[PDB]
Amino acid sequence: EPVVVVGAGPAGLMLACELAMRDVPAVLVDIHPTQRAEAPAMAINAGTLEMLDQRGLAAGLREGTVTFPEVRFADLRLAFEKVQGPREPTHMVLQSRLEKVLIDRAVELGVDLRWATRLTGFEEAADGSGVTVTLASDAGEEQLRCRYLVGCDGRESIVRKQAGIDYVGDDWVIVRGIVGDVAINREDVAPEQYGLSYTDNGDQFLGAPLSPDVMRVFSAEFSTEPPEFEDGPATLEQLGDAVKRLTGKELKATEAHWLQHYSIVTRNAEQYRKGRVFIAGDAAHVHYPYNGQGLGTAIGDAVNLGWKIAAEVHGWAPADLLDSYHVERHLAGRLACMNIQAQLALLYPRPLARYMREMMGEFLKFDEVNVFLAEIVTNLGPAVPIAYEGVPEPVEGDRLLGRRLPKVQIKTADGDMGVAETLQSGRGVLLDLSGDASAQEESGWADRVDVVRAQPVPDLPGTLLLRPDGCVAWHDGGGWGQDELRTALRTWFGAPT
């Protein structure tokens, strides 16, 4: 019986995929007649690449795409090379190219996607075993009965609203500006300034030439006084004042494909799950767009929740399972909101930025804060907490537990392999890196866990257990072994067959 997703944005597309690949029905609604043209995001950080790699959604959208190597906290530099294991630079695949990869993958799996469809209301069952939901369409109002409802519908989520869920947060300034694309003149070399510049008050402009003709525009201006223009469709010459004030120069590039005023607000819903309803992505948290974190956490919420919903659809999910979704992702929600606000504080207000910058100068000389911030801003981090009653804590400096593996090559049967492609089935993975296949395969979970035998791998333990979202749930590099291994599968994977 169906599961309803609202929003064909990055969070909803991925989650519908996550579901359908596990043979669970999923209907995905969206107001847009077609895939939207206003996908502002351009970047994807390493953390999000690993999650796409886990579904084979990233080979291909690497290629031709160029990468940038720094990872910055405001304009300060983080020492990303201090993160454990080999990782990835941020890649420059447009959000629209990624939404389509997710669209045409969603339906190939079997997603009932409905463009031009808005959810306008929903009601829990007095039983509680379902949620009746109503949908406005060109054809008129339908009323579908679903088994779980997930609102991936952005900052103004009605799913979040009608569910009773508070949207906590606060801002001390309002950043605002415009984002979009403008034509160029072509055959002749283009001129002007366009590299991301700052002014002495925190104001930023960036011309990003996507491709010979087309260049994306972003500006960001700080002030307490409420935005002038109420966040709509803009016009090209609201924009050209925009740059002239900030740049000094004039725009001089005709026509504007799509443009969008925006304003920021920092929010993080206090509950990610109420009963049978869930919220995810910008529906659950929103903030100034830095480091690709909004797209990072959106994809990450879906991956987290998808396999967990399927698990209880097929009746093996421990009672704990779906509550762990709120636990692990409200933490990532909190850490994202937090660090982006901390980055703003180094730009505005200028009396505050002055001392916070020096402050961060002092912290960034410490290796733990460089590594902590780097895992956070690239969505490698929030390590989902891993612990089991009774079992001895793994000694001390273990940074594999509750994280996804570095981008390391696995050598198995035939064909070397990225570690994250072992999760493309959708199941758990027990990694055996002995080189001879010695580990005891606890067969009772073989329906939900795949074993993969391979040669040992530098600074990685002899064997590892992965949840279907890729988080390392067990390994034997520390004190752990087969006994701790079992209680780890009882958790996260339920009762053995």
Examine residue 281 and tell whether it contacts ligand FAD (CB under 6 A). yes
Mark the segment that binds ligand FAD (CB under 6 A) among 23-31, 164-172, 328-336, 424-432: 23-31
Candidates 19, 27, 42, 251: give the one binding ligand FAD (CB under 6 A): 42
Q: Is 41 in the site for ligand FAD (CB under 6 A)?
A: yes
How far apart (Å, rounded) are the C-alpha atoms in residues 226 and 242?
17
Shortest distance in whole angstroms from residue 207 CB to a copy of itself: 30
The answer to whether 183 and 209 are in contact (CB under 8 A) is: no
349 binds a copy of itself (CB under 8 A): yes
Structural contact between residues 376 and 339, judged by C-beta atoms closer than 8 angstroms? yes
Q: Considering only CA atoms, which of 68, 36, 360, 229 is closest in space to residue 219?
A: 229
Amino acid at 447: D
Return the closest-CA partner of residue 172 out of 270, 262, 266, 285: 266
100 counts as binding ligand FAD under rule CB under 6 A: no
Q: Which is nearer to a copy of itself, 333 or 470 (CB)?
A: 333
Between 36 and 486, CB nearer to ligand FAD: 36
Kindly state the smallest distance separating residue 449's Cβ from a copy of itself, in Å.
Answer: 33
Choose one: 6-14, 293-301, 334-342, 482-490; the region binding a copy of itself (CB under 8 A).
334-342
Q: Work out how close the CB of 196 gets to ligand FAD at its nearest, in angstroms, rounded to a whole number.
A: 11
DSSP structural state of residue 393: -
How far apart CA 154 and CA 231 sit, in angstroms, is: 15
| 358 sits near a copy of itself (criterion: CB under 8 A) | yes
Query: Can you tell me which of 2, 3, 18, 40 binds ligand FAD, judged by CB under 6 A?
Result: 40
In angstroms, rounded to a whole number, what is the distance separating the alpha carbons of residues 167 and 174? 17
Rounded to the nearest angstrom, the gap between the alpha carbon of residue 62 and the centroid of all alpha carbons in its chain is: 17
Q: Is 216 in the site for ligand FAD (CB under 6 A)?
A: no
Distance CA 440, CA 453 (A): 12
- 372 is in the binding site of which of a copy of itself, ligand FAD, none (Cβ under 5 to 8 A by kind)? a copy of itself
Here the tokens at position 186 are 């072509």
Give the CA distances from residue 288 to residues 2, 120, 124, in Å, rounded to whole numbers and listed in that order.
Answer: 34, 28, 34
Q: Is 109 in the site for ligand FAD (CB under 6 A)?
A: no
CB of 42 to ligand FAD, least distance (A): 5
Residue 174 found at the interface with a copy of itself (CB under 8 A) = no
Of 175, 203, 202, residue with least CA distance to 350:
202
Give the integer Cα–Cα distance in Å for 307 and 402: 16
Q: Which stretch binds ligand FAD (CB under 6 A): 140-148, 194-202, 289-297, 328-336?
A: 289-297
Nearer Cβ to a copy of itself (39/344): 344
Q: What's the CA gap between 487 and 474, in Å, rounded?
A: 10
Could you say whether residue 316 binds a copy of itself (CB under 8 A)? no
Residue 31 makes CB contacts below 8 A (sequence gap 6+) with 116, 117, 118
**Near ligand FAD by CB under 6 A: residue from 207, 289, 428, 478:** 289
- Residue 270 engages a copy of itself in binding (rule: CB under 8 A): no
The piece of 18-26, 99-107, 146-154, 367-375 that touches a copy of itself (CB under 8 A) is 367-375
- Alpha-carbon distance of 288 to 43, in angstroms, equals 14
Question: Does 17 sit near ligand FAD (CB under 6 A)?
Answer: no
Beta-carbon contacts of residue 192 (< 8 Å; ≥ 6 apart): 207, 249, 251, 252, 253
**Token pair in block for residue 132:** 């009746």
Enumerate binding residues for ligand FAD (CB under 6 A): 6-12, 29-32, 36, 40-43, 118-119, 152-154, 158, 179, 262, 281-283, 289, 292, 294-295, 298
Enumerate binding residues for a copy of itself (CB under 8 A): 169-172, 266, 334-335, 337-339, 341-342, 345, 349-352, 354-356, 358-359, 362-363, 366-369, 372
